[PDB]
Design a protein around this ligand. Structure first.
Ligand SMILES: CCCCCCCCCCCCCCCCCC(=O)OC[C@H](COP(=O)([O-])OCC(O)COP(=O)([O-])OC[C@@H](COC(=O)CCCCCCCCCCCCCCCCC)OC(=O)CCCCCCCCCCCCCCCCC)OC(=O)CCCCCCCCCCCCCCCCC
Ligand SMILES: CCCCCCCCCCCCCCCCCC(=O)OC[C@H](COP(=O)([O-])OCC(O)COP(=O)([O-])OC[C@@H](COC(=O)CCCCCCCCCCCCCCCCC)OC(=O)CCCCCCCCCCCCCCCCC)OC(=O)CCCCCCCCCCCCCCCCC
Ligand SMILES: CCCCCCCCCCCCCCCCCC(=O)OC[C@H](COP(=O)([O-])OCC(O)COP(=O)([O-])OC[C@@H](COC(=O)CCCCCCCCCCCCCCCCC)OC(=O)CCCCCCCCCCCCCCCCC)OC(=O)CCCCCCCCCCCCCCCCC
Ligand SMILES: CCCCCCCCCCCCCCCCCC(=O)OC[C@H](COP(=O)([O-])OCC(O)COP(=O)([O-])OC[C@@H](COC(=O)CCCCCCCCCCCCCCCCC)OC(=O)CCCCCCCCCCCCCCCCC)OC(=O)CCCCCCCCCCCCCCCCC
Ligand SMILES: CCCCCCCCCCCCCCCCCC(=O)O[C@@H](COC(=O)CCCCCCCCCCCCCCC)COP(=O)(O)OCC[N+](C)(C)C
Ligand SMILES: CCCCCCCCCCCCCCCCCC(=O)O[C@@H](COC(=O)CCCCCCCCCCCCCCC)COP(=O)(O)OCC[N+](C)(C)C
Ligand SMILES: CCCCCCCCCCCCCCCCCC(=O)O[C@@H](COC(=O)CCCCCCCCCCCCCCC)COP(=O)(O)OCC[N+](C)(C)C
Ligand SMILES: CCCCCCCCCCCCCCCCCCCC(=O)O[C@H](COC(=O)CCCCCCCCCCCCCC)COP(=O)(O)OCCN
Lengths: 145, 104, 205, 80, 111, 47, 82, 61, 375
């Protein structure tokens, strides 16, 4: 329970660190740590395959593309530090306003089965998977040109 | 009195904070395009996590499917957007200084 | 008539009346009745209560206008250059003054409307015209010469438009149906419906 | 439905041919083959549009009769 | 409660799309195969298939010749349109066998 | 030239057109979700 | 020569007034981003607004129109000063 | 200078007029597919680089 | 399995055409007319109703004026996405279809830009991308909250209503169209300002996505008219006209007048075809007259449908605003006529590729009298 709470609470700090830092490379590192913490949150809800998917697709592949771009477009963004006290508390107040008093539901634990998930992906929800494949094909054809 | 109720409230707070940090973070703290897309990815991950949470809550498979759909669509969008960013930076004229930081 | 000898149009007997006949056998309504909140806000009995219920609209509009202008200023200020002055000290007066002056104008409008209706005792066009005239007069206190005339006229004209097209227009054309037989003319042989058409359900957004 | 649809279609095929010649800078009599083709296809298309309109008119009549609109035999004659 | 046991090899599965309708007409075949549906395609439908094949051959040749590949475009277009229309006819015949669509000729022809 | 017959035929044509239009204006919702309003319509859903 | 309209003001003074529009131009995405976000949240909140009288709605629209400042007006008059 | 300039002009005009029909029609097609190949996002441009004077595939891209 | 075959045939068709084009790629046929005809034939297998037949008609008329196999393939992808937007039954279908369409828009915008046009076209594509990410993220977050609260995914909700407001391009969600379509190819702007709307209109009508609020359509009408009157550039005029008209059509569609909006979208496609694919002044003049709603052409019928639906619902403010904003927009259209014939000598490119432009002008002139029954 303490471990679950620590992860749920750490997600917000790892999200704040991304926007606050002025270096695009450092924000990517913070985002990778955020993605791992999201894997860890999904473990508490009972998902292993889905939490694996988040790490494989995002940490494994997407971050590599982001960092490839970041080195290619390398720019001097160490111009100045504008992180005055007045700005940071304003950001925190905005965040508190948005994330307060929303409807909360008891924390669930749900065991998943990739047998059932596979059967549904390829029998009943087969319309979904083929359209996702079409979207991937669109992205491939568009990005390569 | 109930740990699950407390954990549910903490999760709601955390996930909402992650979403709002993703959507408004890079624009509030004026950043380059590359950070904007990374924060958009953060927000999409927040929404997909909420759907997985709902699936665990209701013992239903709809959110699992919608989450894999989010992962695919977000990755495709990010790939195309990074293509556009690289092409945009390669066409920059010498006088242009912070081409990527339109939010300046 | 389409002739040059007798007057065009026609006349209906005032003595003779036609019994109302239902447009359809069974009536199903997809138009919801006014809510209790709408009747509460529309109530002008207590002028203070009427004013305080309807000002949040004016304050909201003033806040959006001030936020628009303040963001136009903020967008321009350079992040790369450190600024000696404090930006919020510059920007807060904009939003606060816009919101305050908008709220004051809306307060005059609503208060004068309710006070005139109470004193007159009747719901009329004149209450809106007088409240608008007062609001436009407050708008043009120290303004140059055309504006003392034009703003009372515009602010008075606005409630006339609201009354004419928000209240009179709907009530004038309630009876007209468009299906079955024309509202005036039921003697004519047109297909008669068992039920009225429902083109949409009652809305819930 | 319309009893003048085919004549209209033939005239409108003439409209197509002559307008296409005028826009391109040619005289109205140029490219004679376009005139015959435009007239014939436009006549056939105008006819076909008329039957499509009639068919959906009749479908609407059937639907409203099912729903409860008490259409008479003469009203049923209005929809061919 | 207790987890229900699952048999891994026999897990209930179903096709993605379903036609929500009870058969109005008699059911010659509850689950027709592809060849059963093709064998029940009417002669007029086959003539329509042949007409589409010929028309698409002519059109494919006309369009491909503008790109200096007339023969290949003609054959590809013919195959494409013929396959599509044949599947449409087979779907109609399968619906007729299932009793969803009119089947008087089908029931007479194959008892 | 029977003007009376022409007048009455023209008026009959216009009156028939009006009746047809008012029948054509009797429209319920055709929404696929709306099974209540259209309960009697013969439909099949493939979904 | 033809009769022509008299142009008020001096040529160089008018040109100097017009040159005050030549200032660093921000890109419009920054305004659009905030408008999109707050507009989405605003549309969500509007469904919960109380029903207002048509007269009050029209007066609010009039006040908003009068209070609206064109983006060019701020452009010409903006000073990076206290 | 006028005499010499018109000598060069005559050489050019002689070069243009002296081409045979089959060559002229081929050159018309060269100009046409030059215009069609101006778009550099075409799929074929990814395949090959075309010779400028005669739009024939010269080397792969 | 037979019900699945109907959808599967469309896939197999598209895949084999794709691989045939990849194999038969040559300089001899850069304009692949044969694959265009094959794509048009393949899209006939997806027609099941009148709205789907309208989708097919517009898709084919669009694919005629795209050049190359690759752009035609992505137009076919847009057609598939639109066909599934019409058939979507819950949140997931809506999302999958519409962001697939957004991906197709990004690709089509990228591939129709020259090297000299990259600086502005790629900027507009990137700005469109970020705004679309905002819209989709808000949609899916609120969808997660709704799916948690109700236990079911129902496409009759405020969330999908606001998302479809973004897709339509009304009131506070029209800026992405202004930024993107100003910097992209004229055909890309034309096909993606008309074709996407039909699927959204069908989804709204069929899934009961209607709200009691009239503010957004009113704001769309007034803002579009006034900004059209104040806009110097011609592209902005045409772009703001669509905002005004789609706000008015949104007001009509909420009240259940599906037939009239389905006719309006087609008449608007035909009317906009000529002004966007400007090759002749006279064709553009007729197109601009049709967009204005002017009587001798089919555009009068389409606007008349919407206006006739307005008087039925009997909302006076909407009618008064409609009249005044229509006058204001008419001034901008008159500016467009003035620029062509009454300002200066005009010389345009001789782009003699009027595939369906002459047919569209003929249809605008002719079609008024056959369709007069509608109004
Ligand atoms: C109204 C209300 C609205 C409601 C709904 C409206 C409906 C909406 C939809 C309606 C749409 C209508 C509007 C669009 C109209 C369509 C556009 C259009 O007009 O055509 C565009 C298109 C544009 O042509 P273009 O401007 O030259 O540009 C194309 C380029 O050439 C490009 O070159 P290319 O490389 O692409 O070449 C391909 C093409 C393009 O090539 C050409 O077009 C060149 C010209 C073709 C050869 C000349 C045609 C010969 C016959 C013409 C008759 C003219 C008579 C006038 C003079 C009288 C002579 C005695 O070649 C073809 O013509 C293919 C067709 C094959 C037929 C060829 C002729 C066969 C021999 C004759 C058959 C029968 C003869 C009997 C009698 C003959 C003597 C009368 O026109 C054609 O392609 C013509 C195709 C057909 C040729 C005419 C054949 C008619 C048959 C003879 C008449 C017999 C009576 C007819 C009834 C019986 C039929 C058998
Ligand atoms: C079967 C046996 C055969 C027997 C025959 C039976 C056939 C039936 C009819 C067939 C006759 C052929 C039709 C003519 C086709 C070409 C017409 C044309 O190009 O116009 C100018 C053309 C002469 O212009 P042009 O010197 O040769 O140079 C034109 C250049 O291309 C460009 O020159 P620009 O760049 O210098 O432009 C300057 C422009 C100054 O700029 C402007 O003013 C533009 C203003 C926008 C349009 C005007 C808006 C107002 C128009 C009102 C309509 C007039 C009728 C009013 C009656 C009320 C109807 C409700 O000034 C003008 O162009 C002329 C001003 C007056 C003409 C406006 C009327 C044209 C309406 C649309 C024409 C149809 C095009 C169809 C396209 C076909 C496929 C491409 O024709 C004329 O001599 C006068 C116009 C004749 C009007 C008849 C067209 C019917 C339109 C009435 C609509 C009713 C529905 C249609 C039913 C038709 C009966 C089924
Ligand atoms: C931190 C972020 C910063 C933003 C903060 C807010 C964030 C948004 C939150 C929520 C947003 C949703 C709600 C906001 C309003 C929706 C507008 C919108 O979002 O479009 C995107 C818009 C940007 O779009 P854009 O395409 O880039 O800009 C187009 C323009 O060309 C822009 O170029 P321009 O600025 O250079 O040109 C402006 C042009 C643009 O034209 C307009 O502004 C059109 C506005 C007309 C009214 C709009 C429809 C009103 C219906 C309201 C419905 C609710 C009430 C229902 C009943 C009312 C019945 C009418 O108008 C003018 O030229 C200046 C005059 C302004 C009003 C003109 C009418 C004057 C009538 C008064 C007559 C008195 C004079 C008599 C004496 C005359 C002597 C001869 O973003 C905004 O502007 C939002 C700013 C929020 C400030 C609005 C303040 C009041 C809002 C409520 C009052 C409603 C009246 C509207 C006032 C003007 C609003 C534009
Ligand atoms: C020839 C006989 C045709 C007469 C009747 C047609 C029905 C039989 C179809 C036979 C095919 C003829 C096509 C004509 C219409 C197309 C409709 C259709 O096909 O499906 C409807 C039909 C049944 O649907 P439905 O009759 O509409 O009734 C269903 C409910 O009522 C729900 O549908 P609903 O929406 O109609 O509901 C009633 C509706 C009442 O709605 C109506 O009243 C309809 C009004 C007629 C509008 C007509 C214009 C539509 C434009 C589409 C053009 C057709 C393109 C053809 C595409 C298919 C080609 C085969 O009430 C409403 O309130 C809904 C609003 C409707 C929209 C508003 C109408 C405005 C339209 C836009 C007009 C704007 C003006 C534009 C310019 C016009 C100027 C003159 O489905 C079928 O029968 C099977 C479709 C199979 C198609 C292709 C499959 C065969 C080939 C497969 C293999 C393909 C690959 C191999 C290729 C082989 C060749 C190489
Ligand atoms: C634009 C739409 C996007 C999304 C599309 C979703 C809709 C498509 C979903 C289906 C995807 C393809 C799945 C196959 C479709 C047809 C089903 C089928 O052919 O398989 C048969 C399997 O049976 C067969 O018919 C075997 C012959 C199959 C021959 C091949 C037919 C299907 C080919 C699929 C195409 C893939 C080939 C590669 C793609 C180019 C059905 O299984 P059963 O009949 O229940 O099991 C058989 C047991 N018994 C017969 C006794 C009842
Ligand atoms: C009259 C009935 C019999 C017609 C004979 C044709 C039957 C042959 C089988 C069908 C083949 C396709 C039909 C031809 C239509 C279009 C073909 C075409 O495009 O014509 C020319 C060029 O395009 C045109 O000229 C336009 C012609 C348009 C159509 C004019 C003919 C109209 C009648 C033919 C189709 C009638 C129906 C066909 C049978 C149903 C093709 O150029 P090439 O690829 O170089 O081939 C020519 C071979 N060689 C040069 C080596 C000698
Ligand atoms: C009841 C009707 C009223 C309702 C209206 C809607 C219904 C429409 C019915 C009529 C539709 C007619 C559409 C006319 C389109 C015009 C034809 C066309 O565009 O041809 C192009 C085609 O261009 C191409 O790209 C060719 C590739 C495709 C070729 C056609 C493919 C055919 C596919 C088969 C379709 C059959 C239907 C399938 C079964 C229904 C040729 O023009 P270009 O060469 O590109 O430039 C012209 C230059 N200039 C005029 C200035 C000289
Ligand atoms: C588009 C209409 C807008 C009006 C344009 C007028 C010119 C604008 C100048 C601005 C002046 C403010 C607007 C005042 C117009 C109202 C007319 C005054 C008549 C009047 O005072 O009688 C009232 C009723 O008239 C009424 O208030 C309702 C009459 C409706 C106004 C006239 C409508 C047709 C005018 C169109 C002219 C041409 C259009 C071009 C603008 C009182 O009535 P009561 O019930 O209160 O009894 C009293 C019991 N206490």
């Amino acid at each position: 329970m303490l471990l679950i709470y620590i992860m749920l609470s750490n997600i917000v700090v790892l999200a704040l660190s991304v926007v606050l830092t002025s270096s695009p490379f450092m924000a990517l590192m913070y985002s990778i740590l955020l993605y791992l913490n999201v894997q860890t949150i999904l473990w508490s809800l009972g998902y292993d395959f889905m939490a694996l998917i988040y790490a494989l697709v995002y940490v494994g592949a997407l971050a590599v593309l982001f960092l490839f771009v970041v080195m290619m477009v390398r720019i001097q963004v160490s111009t100045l530090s504008t992180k005055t006290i007045q700005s940071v508390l304003s950001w925190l107040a905005i965040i508190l306003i948005f994330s307060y008093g929303d409807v909360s539901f008891s924390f669930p634990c749900g065991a998943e089965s990739l047998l059932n998930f596979g059967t549904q992906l390829y029998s009943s929800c087969s319309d979904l998977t083929l359209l996702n494949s079409l979207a991937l094909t669109i992205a491939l054809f568009g990005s390569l040109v | 009195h109930n740990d699950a109720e407390f954990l549910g409230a903490v999760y709601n707070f955390s996930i909402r904070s992650v979403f709002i940090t993703g959507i408004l973070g890079a624009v509030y703290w004026r950043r380059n395009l590359i950070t904007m897309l990374l924060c958009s990815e953060i927000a999409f991950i927040a929404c997909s996590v909420n759907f997985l949470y709902a699936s665990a809550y209701l013992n239903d498979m709809a959110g699992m499917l919608f989450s894999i759909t989010i992962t695919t669509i977000s990755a495709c969008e990010t790939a195309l957007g990074l293509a556009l960013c690289v092409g945009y930076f390669q066409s920059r004229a010498a006088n242009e200084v912070e081409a990527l930081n339109l939010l300046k | 008539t389409f002739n040059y000898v007798i007057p065009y149009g026609g006349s209906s007997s005032y003595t003779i009346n036609n019994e109302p006949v239902k447009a359809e056998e069974v009536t199903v309504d997809f138009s919801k009745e006014p809510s209790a909140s709408s009747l509460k806000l529309a109530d002008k009995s207590d002028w203070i209560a009427y004013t305080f219920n309807n000002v949040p609209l004016m304050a909201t509009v003033g806040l959006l206008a001030g936020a628009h202008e303040a963001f136009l200023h903020y967008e321009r200020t350079p992040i790369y250059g450190k600024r000696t002055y404090n930006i919020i000290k510059k920007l807060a007066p904009i939003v606060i003054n816009k919101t305050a002056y908008a709220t004051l104008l809306g307060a005059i409008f609503c208060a004068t409307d309710a006070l005139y209706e109470n004193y007159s005792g009747k719901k009329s066009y004149t209450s809106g015209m007088v409240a608008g005239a007062a609001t436009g007069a407050v708008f043009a206190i120290g303004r140059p010469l055309p504006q003392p005339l034009v703003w009372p006229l515009v602010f008075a004209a606005a409630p006339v438009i609201a009354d004419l097209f928000g209240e009179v227009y709907p009530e004038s054309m309630k009876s007209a149906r468009g299906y079955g037989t024309p509202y005036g003319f039921e003697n004519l042989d047109d297909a008669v419906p068992t039920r009225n058409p429902i083109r949409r359900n009652p809305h819930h957004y | 439905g319309w009893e003048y649809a085919g004549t209209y279609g033939a005239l409108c095929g003439m409209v197509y041919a002559i307008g296409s010649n005028v826009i391109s800078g040619r005289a109205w009599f140029r490219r004679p083959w376009v005139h015959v083709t435009s007239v014939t296809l436009s006549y056939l298309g105008s006819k076909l549009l008329d039957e499509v309109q009639d068919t959906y008119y009749l479908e609407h009549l059937k639907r409203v009769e099912r729903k409860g609109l008490q259409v008479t035999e003469e009203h049923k004659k209005l929809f061919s | 409660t207790w987890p229900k046991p699952i048999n891994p090899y026999d897990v209930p599965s179903s096709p993605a799309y379903h036609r929500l309708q009870e058969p109005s007409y008699p059911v010659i075949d509850k689950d027709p195969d592809f060849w059963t549906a093709v064998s029940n395609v009417r002669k007029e439908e086959w003539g329509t298939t042949a007409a589409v094949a010929a028309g698409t051959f002519v059109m494919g040749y006309y369009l491909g010749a503008k790109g200096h590949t007339g023969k290949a475009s003609a054959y590809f277009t013919s195959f494409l349109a013929t396959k599509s229309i044949t599947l449409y006819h087979a779907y109609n015949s399968a619906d007729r066998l299932m009793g969803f669509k009119e089947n008087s000729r089908e029931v007479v022809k194959n008892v | 030239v029977d003007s009376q017959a022409e007048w009455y035929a023209e008026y009959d044509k216009l009156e028939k057109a009006r009746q047809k239009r008012r029948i054509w204006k009797w429209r319920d919702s055709d929404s696929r979700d709306e099974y209540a309003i259209n309960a009697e319509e013969p439909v099949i859903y493939i979904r | 020569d033809e009769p022509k309209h008299q142009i008020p003001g001096n040529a160089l003074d008018n040109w100097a007034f017009l040159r005050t529009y030549a200032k660093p131009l921000p890109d419009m995405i920054h305004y659009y981003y905030y408008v999109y976000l707050f507009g989405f949240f605003f549309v969500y909140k509007v469904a919960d607004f109380p029903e207002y009288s048509p007269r009050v709605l029209v007066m609010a629209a009039l006040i908003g129109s009068l209070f609206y400042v064109r983006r060019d007006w701020v452009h010409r008059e903006f000073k990076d000063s206290p | 200078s006028s005499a010499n300039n018109y000598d060069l002009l005559g050489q050019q005009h002689k070069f243009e007029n002296s081409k045979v029909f089959e060559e002229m029609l081929v050159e018309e097609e060269i100009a046409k597919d030059r215009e069609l190949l101006e778009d550099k996002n075409l799929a074929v441009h990814q395949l090959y680089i075309f010779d400028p004077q005669t739009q024939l595939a010269a080397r792969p891209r | 399995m037979w019900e699945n075959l109907w959808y599967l045939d469309i896939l197999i068709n598209v895949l084999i055409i794709t691989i045939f084009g990849l194999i038969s790629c040559s300089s001899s046929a850069t304009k692949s007319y044969d694959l265009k005809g094959c794509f048009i034939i393949s899209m006939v297998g997806g027609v099941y109703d009148i709205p789907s037949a309208i989708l097919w008609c517009l898709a084919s008329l669009s694919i005629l004026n795209f050049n190359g196999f690759f752009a035609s393939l992505f137009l076919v992808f847009t057609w598939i996405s639109n066909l599934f937007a019409m058939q979507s039954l819950n949140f997931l279908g809506i999302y999958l279809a519409f962001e697939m369409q957004s991906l197709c828009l990004l690709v089509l915008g990228k591939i129709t830009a020259n090297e000299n046009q990259r600086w502005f076209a790629y900027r507009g594509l990137l700005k469109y991308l970020v705004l679309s990410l905002i819209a989709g993220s808000i949609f899916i977050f609120h969808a997660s909250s709704s799916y948690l609260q109700s236990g079911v995914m129902i496409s009759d909700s405020l969330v999908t209503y606001v998302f479809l407001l973004f897709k339509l391009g009304v009131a506070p969600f029209h800026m992405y169209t202004l930024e993107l379509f100003s910097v992209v190819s004229r055909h890309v702007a034309f096909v993606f300002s008309t074709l996407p709307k039909l699927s959204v209109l069908y989804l709204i009508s069929n899934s009961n996505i209607g709200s009691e609020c009239v503010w957004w359509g009113l704001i769309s009408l007034w803002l579009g008219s006034i900004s059209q009157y104040q806009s110097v550039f011609v592209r902005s005029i045409l772009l703001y006209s669509s905002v005004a008209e789609i706000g008015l059509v949104l007001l009509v569609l909420q009240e259940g007048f599906s037939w009239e909006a389905f006719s309006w979208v087609s008449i608007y496609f035909l009317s906009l075809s000529g002004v966007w694919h400007a090759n002749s002044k006279f064709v553009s003049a007729i197109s601009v007259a049709s967009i204005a709603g002017l009587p001798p052409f089919l555009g009068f019928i389409g606007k008349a449908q919407i206006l006739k639906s307005l008087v039925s619902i009997n909302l006076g403010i909407l009618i008064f605003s409609s009249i005044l904003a229509a006058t204001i927009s008419f001034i901008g259209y008159l500016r467009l006529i003035r620029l062509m014939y009454l300002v200066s000598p005009v010389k345009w490119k001789n782009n003699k590729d009027s595939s369906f432009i002459n047919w569209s002008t003929w249809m605008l002139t002719v079609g008024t009298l056959p369709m007069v029954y509608s109004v």
